[PDB]
Enzyme design. Structure first.
Site, PDB file in Angstrom:
ATOM      1  N   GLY A  66       0.874  -1.164   0.000  1.00 54.41           N
ATOM      2  CA  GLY A  66       0.000   0.000   0.000  1.00 54.41           C
ATOM      3  C   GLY A  66       0.914   1.217   0.000  1.00 54.41           C
ATOM      4  O   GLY A  66       0.759   2.160   0.792  1.00 54.41           O
ATOM      5  N   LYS A 167      -1.124   0.977   9.852  1.00 51.26           N
ATOM      6  CA  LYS A 167      -2.053   2.096   9.765  1.00 51.26           C
ATOM      7  C   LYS A 167      -3.074   1.714  10.849  1.00 51.26           C
ATOM      8  O   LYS A 167      -3.512   0.552  10.930  1.00 51.26           O
ATOM      9  CB  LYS A 167      -2.694   2.063   8.374  1.00 51.26           C
ATOM     10  CG  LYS A 167      -3.443   3.299   7.899  1.00 51.26           C
ATOM     11  CD  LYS A 167      -3.730   3.182   6.388  1.00 51.26           C
ATOM     12  CE  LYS A 167      -4.386   4.428   5.805  1.00 51.26           C
ATOM     13  NZ  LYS A 167      -3.513   5.622   5.877  1.00 51.26           N
ATOM     14  N   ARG A 169      -6.537   3.275  12.457  1.00 51.29           N
ATOM     15  CA  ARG A 169      -7.628   4.241  12.583  1.00 51.29           C
ATOM     16  C   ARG A 169      -8.874   3.466  13.002  1.00 51.29           C
ATOM     17  O   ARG A 169      -9.577   2.891  12.166  1.00 51.29           O
ATOM     18  CB  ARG A 169      -7.852   4.960  11.251  1.00 51.29           C
ATOM     19  CG  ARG A 169      -8.322   6.399  11.392  1.00 51.29           C
ATOM     20  CD  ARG A 169      -9.819   6.488  11.569  1.00 51.29           C
ATOM     21  NE  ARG A 169     -10.569   6.311  10.327  1.00 51.29           N
ATOM     22  CZ  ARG A 169     -11.787   5.781  10.279  1.00 51.29           C
ATOM     23  NH1 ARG A 169     -12.376   5.376  11.404  1.00 51.29           N
ATOM     24  NH2 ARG A 169     -12.430   5.678   9.122  1.00 51.29           N
ATOM     25  N   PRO A 171     -12.523   2.149  14.043  1.00 49.64           N
ATOM     26  CA  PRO A 171     -13.872   2.400  13.519  1.00 49.64           C
ATOM     27  C   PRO A 171     -14.651   3.337  14.437  1.00 49.64           C
ATOM     28  O   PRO A 171     -14.675   3.155  15.670  1.00 49.64           O
ATOM     29  CB  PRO A 171     -14.495   1.010  13.528  1.00 49.64           C
ATOM     30  CG  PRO A 171     -13.333   0.112  13.268  1.00 49.64           C
ATOM     31  CD  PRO A 171     -12.258   0.700  14.134  1.00 49.64           C
ATOM     32  N   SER A 197      -8.244  13.928  11.858  1.00 50.09           N
ATOM     33  CA  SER A 197      -7.987  12.509  11.623  1.00 50.09           C
ATOM     34  C   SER A 197      -7.872  11.808  12.964  1.00 50.09           C
ATOM     35  O   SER A 197      -7.396  12.398  13.936  1.00 50.09           O
ATOM     36  CB  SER A 197      -6.689  12.308  10.826  1.00 50.09           C
ATOM     37  OG  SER A 197      -6.445  10.934  10.505  1.00 50.09           O
ATOM     38  N   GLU A 199      -6.464   8.818  12.901  1.00 48.04           N
ATOM     39  CA  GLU A 199      -5.385   7.915  12.516  1.00 48.04           C
ATOM     40  C   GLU A 199      -4.082   8.067  13.286  1.00 48.04           C
ATOM     41  O   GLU A 199      -3.515   9.171  13.402  1.00 48.04           O
ATOM     42  CB  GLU A 199      -5.110   8.097  11.022  1.00 48.04           C
ATOM     43  CG  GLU A 199      -3.946   7.323  10.443  1.00 48.04           C
ATOM     44  CD  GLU A 199      -3.856   7.484   8.932  1.00 48.04           C
ATOM     45  OE1 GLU A 199      -4.637   6.826   8.225  1.00 48.04           O
ATOM     46  OE2 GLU A 199      -3.035   8.279   8.445  1.00 48.04           O
ATOM     47  N   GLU A 225     -12.459   8.220  19.755  1.00 49.02           N
ATOM     48  CA  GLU A 225     -13.203   9.384  19.264  1.00 49.02           C
ATOM     49  C   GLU A 225     -13.017  10.554  20.240  1.00 49.02           C
ATOM     50  O   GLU A 225     -12.556  11.624  19.845  1.00 49.02           O
ATOM     51  CB  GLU A 225     -14.685   8.994  19.066  1.00 49.02           C
ATOM     52  CG  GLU A 225     -15.729  10.093  19.172  1.00 49.02           C
ATOM     53  CD  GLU A 225     -17.133   9.623  18.786  1.00 49.02           C
ATOM     54  OE1 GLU A 225     -17.299   9.104  17.672  1.00 49.02           O
ATOM     55  OE2 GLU A 225     -18.085   9.791  19.577  1.00 49.02           O
TER      56      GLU A 225
HETATM   57  P1  LIG Z   1      -8.212   8.885   8.013  1.00 46.05           P
HETATM   58  O1  LIG Z   1      -7.968   7.455   8.349  1.00 46.05           O
HETATM   59  O2  LIG Z   1      -8.202   9.883   9.085  1.00 46.05           O
HETATM   60  O3  LIG Z   1      -9.520   9.188   7.088  1.00 46.05           O
HETATM   61  P2  LIG Z   1     -11.022   8.523   6.818  1.00 46.05           P
HETATM   62  O4  LIG Z   1     -11.461   9.061   5.498  1.00 46.05           O
HETATM   63  O5  LIG Z   1     -10.946   7.050   7.003  1.00 46.05           O
HETATM   64  O6  LIG Z   1     -12.074   9.022   7.881  1.00 46.05           O
HETATM   65  P3  LIG Z   1     -12.446  10.575   8.285  1.00 46.05           P
HETATM   66  O7  LIG Z   1     -12.294  11.561   7.226  1.00 46.05           O
HETATM   67  O8  LIG Z   1     -11.910  10.868   9.633  1.00 46.05           O
HETATM   68  O9  LIG Z   1     -14.018  10.251   8.469  1.00 46.05           O
HETATM   69  C1  LIG Z   1     -15.010  10.154   7.432  1.00 46.05           C
HETATM   70  C2  LIG Z   1     -16.363  10.686   7.924  1.00 46.05           C
HETATM   71  O10 LIG Z   1     -16.725  10.059   9.209  1.00 46.05           O
HETATM   72  C3  LIG Z   1     -17.168  11.140  10.003  1.00 46.05           C
HETATM   73  N1  LIG Z   1     -16.121  11.288  11.081  1.00 46.05           N
HETATM   74  C4  LIG Z   1     -14.806  11.750  11.048  1.00 46.05           C
HETATM   75  N2  LIG Z   1     -14.201  11.693  12.195  1.00 46.05           N
HETATM   76  C5  LIG Z   1     -12.874  12.086  12.554  1.00 46.05           C
HETATM   77  C6  LIG Z   1     -15.155  11.164  13.073  1.00 46.05           C
HETATM   78  C7  LIG Z   1     -16.317  10.919  12.392  1.00 46.05           C
HETATM   79  N3  LIG Z   1     -17.454  10.401  12.869  1.00 46.05           N
HETATM   80  C8  LIG Z   1     -17.361  10.114  14.154  1.00 46.05           C
HETATM   81  N4  LIG Z   1     -18.369   9.547  14.739  1.00 46.05           N
HETATM   82  N5  LIG Z   1     -16.262  10.317  14.919  1.00 46.05           N
HETATM   83  C9  LIG Z   1     -15.096  10.844  14.473  1.00 46.05           C
HETATM   84  O11 LIG Z   1     -14.215  10.906  15.321  1.00 46.05           O
HETATM   85  C10 LIG Z   1     -17.413  12.389   9.089  1.00 46.05           C
HETATM   86  O12 LIG Z   1     -18.669  12.296   8.344  1.00 46.05           O
HETATM   87  C11 LIG Z   1     -16.315  12.244   8.112  1.00 46.05           C
HETATM   88  O13 LIG Z   1     -16.775  13.081   7.029  1.00 46.05           O
HETATM   89  N1  LIG Z   2      -4.760  -5.365  -0.699  1.00 48.09           N
HETATM   90  C1  LIG Z   2      -3.999  -4.287  -0.995  1.00 48.09           C
HETATM   91  N2  LIG Z   2      -2.683  -4.410  -1.272  1.00 48.09           N
HETATM   92  C2  LIG Z   2      -1.894  -3.387  -1.521  1.00 48.09           C
HETATM   93  N3  LIG Z   2      -2.217  -2.136  -1.552  1.00 48.09           N
HETATM   94  C3  LIG Z   2      -3.544  -2.002  -1.279  1.00 48.09           C
HETATM   95  C4  LIG Z   2      -4.466  -2.975  -0.999  1.00 48.09           C
HETATM   96  N4  LIG Z   2      -5.719  -2.426  -0.766  1.00 48.09           N
HETATM   97  C5  LIG Z   2      -5.530  -1.150  -0.920  1.00 48.09           C
HETATM   98  N5  LIG Z   2      -4.229  -0.818  -1.237  1.00 48.09           N
HETATM   99  C6  LIG Z   2      -3.602   0.504  -1.528  1.00 48.09           C
HETATM  100  O1  LIG Z   2      -3.409   1.186  -0.309  1.00 48.09           O
HETATM  101  C7  LIG Z   2      -3.282   2.578  -0.633  1.00 48.09           C
HETATM  102  C8  LIG Z   2      -3.850   3.397   0.487  1.00 48.09           C
HETATM  103  S1  LIG Z   2      -3.275   5.098   0.441  1.00 48.09           S
HETATM  104  C9  LIG Z   2      -1.477   4.875   0.399  1.00 48.09           C
HETATM  105  C10 LIG Z   2      -0.609   6.123   0.213  1.00 48.09           C
HETATM  106  C11 LIG Z   2       0.880   5.788   0.038  1.00 48.09           C
HETATM  107  N6  LIG Z   2       1.360   5.007   1.168  1.00 48.09           N
HETATM  108  C12 LIG Z   2       1.707   7.064  -0.131  1.00 48.09           C
HETATM  109  O2  LIG Z   2       2.887   7.019   0.293  1.00 48.09           O
HETATM  110  O3  LIG Z   2       1.368   7.849  -1.042  1.00 48.09           O
HETATM  111  C13 LIG Z   2      -3.987   2.829  -1.954  1.00 48.09           C
HETATM  112  O4  LIG Z   2      -3.072   3.376  -2.968  1.00 48.09           O
HETATM  113  C14 LIG Z   2      -4.483   1.430  -2.333  1.00 48.09           C
HETATM  114  O5  LIG Z   2      -4.319   1.153  -3.758  1.00 48.09           O
END
Ligand SMILES: *P(=O)(O)OP(=O)(O)OP(=O)(O)OC[C@H]1O[C@@H](N2CN(C)c3c2nc(N)[nH]c3=O)[C@H](O)[C@@H]1O
Ligand SMILES: Nc1ncnc2c1ncn2[C@@H]1O[C@H](CSCC[C@H](N)C(=O)O)[C@@H](O)[C@H]1O
Length: 289
Positions: A66, A167, A169, A171, A197, A199, A225
RNA sequence: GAAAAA
């Protein structure tokens, strides 16, 4: 503004919590270009330096699943390369990698989405090389997450790495399906992530042919959260007045603590000196002003 | 999750 001794490095250290405000998602999440690429570089540099520090990085094969586009990875590659470290990179992803990774004698670009069988294949074609695992896969709903986590675990089982960075993050508690297990490890907080985020990265060094899985429940989901919201809305949205540095925002304060653990082949008289230098080269390379 | 100019 605020005065802080040190930024929150690992999640467990976040001292306060705040109930998520859904309106948050309506705010801008990316303030600078290639923010994600920067965020990835710092975490990887940091983890990979802990590895260097332990003597686990030389002679190792870094398998980054990935990895696309991976623009920041070329900087990482040049870094340890110039440091004298011997590393073999294998970047696997179904999406196209940045052209600056082509023809690099020590990096293997593999276009393909990883699965169980392909893990056995890379494990096979790699062994007895010491593998270091870096995942970043993301298929986003809880189902997708749980799936990605099911793979990340078997990546460990099959690849049997000596260390790994996953990674992580959790649910959101309102889209919960069921409880699941994840490897045990240090939950590293990352700067320059999207404004709200949740994450973080699960960093783990293996004793050998080991691991260990921990349970995650909806109660845990709520704690994340809560803590993460607080960190993003408040803490990160601050300016540290006792931070002697051009930018005094929390993320820069946090990056100064990340960037000061990384080794460089040049000599520097002070930490701030080196930090200024590294941040400069990273920013210029990534075209972030 | 990543996402310059155009
Ligand atoms: P990444 O791993 O941070 O990004 P990802 O796209 O997976 O998720 P994120 O944008 O954080 O979330 C997408 C939608 O879920 C709701 N969010 C965000 N968020 C931080 C958060 C949400 N909902 C709850 N219950 N709690 C949280 O802590 C919003 O609709 C985002 O648009
Ligand atoms: N089973 C799988 N094996 C490998 N890559 C996967 C995968 N499922 C999803 N991915 C990849 O995981 C990535 C998540 S985003 C990754 C961003 C990248 N690490 C950066 O340095 O730019 C996506 O590009 C997606 O194609």
């Amino acid at each position: 503004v605020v005065s802080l001794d040190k930024p929150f490095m690992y999640f467990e250290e976040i001292d306060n919590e705040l109930d998520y405000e859904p309106e948050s998602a309506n705010e801008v999440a990316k303030k600078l270009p290639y923010q994600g690429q920067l965020k990835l570089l710092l975490g990887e540099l940091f983890f990979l330096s802990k590895l260097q520090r332990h003597g686990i990085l030389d002679g190792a094969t870094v398998v980054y699943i990935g990895s696309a586009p991976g623009t920041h990875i070329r900087y990482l590659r040049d870094h340890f390369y110039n440091l004298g470290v011997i590393i073999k990179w294998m970047l696997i992803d179904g999406r196209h990698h940045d052209p600056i990774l082509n023809g690099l004698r020590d990096v293997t670009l593999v276009t393909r989405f990883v699965d169980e069988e392909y893990l056995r294949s890379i494990k096979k074609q790699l062994h007895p090389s010491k593998i270091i695992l870096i995942s970043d896969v993301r298929s986003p709903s809880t189902a997708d997450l749980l799936s990605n986590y099911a793979l990340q675990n078997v990546m460990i089982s099959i690849l049997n790495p000596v260390a790994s960075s996953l990674k992580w993050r959790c649910p959101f508690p309102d889209q919960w399906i069921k409880d699941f297990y994840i490897p045990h490890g240090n939950k590293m907080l990352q700067p320059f992530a999207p404004s709200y985020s949740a994450e973080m990265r699960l960093l783990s060094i293996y004793t050998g042919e080991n691991m260990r899985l921990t349970r995650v429940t909806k109660s845990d989901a709520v704690n994340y959260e809560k803590k993460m919201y607080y960190l993003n809305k408040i803490v990160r949205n601050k300016v540290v007045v006792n931070f002697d540095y051009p930018n005094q925002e929390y993320d820069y304060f946090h990056m100064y603590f990340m960037l000061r653990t990384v080794y460089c082949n040049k000599t520097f008289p002070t930490t701030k000196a080196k930090v200024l230098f590294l941040q400069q080269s990273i920013f210029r390379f990534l075209n972030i002003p």
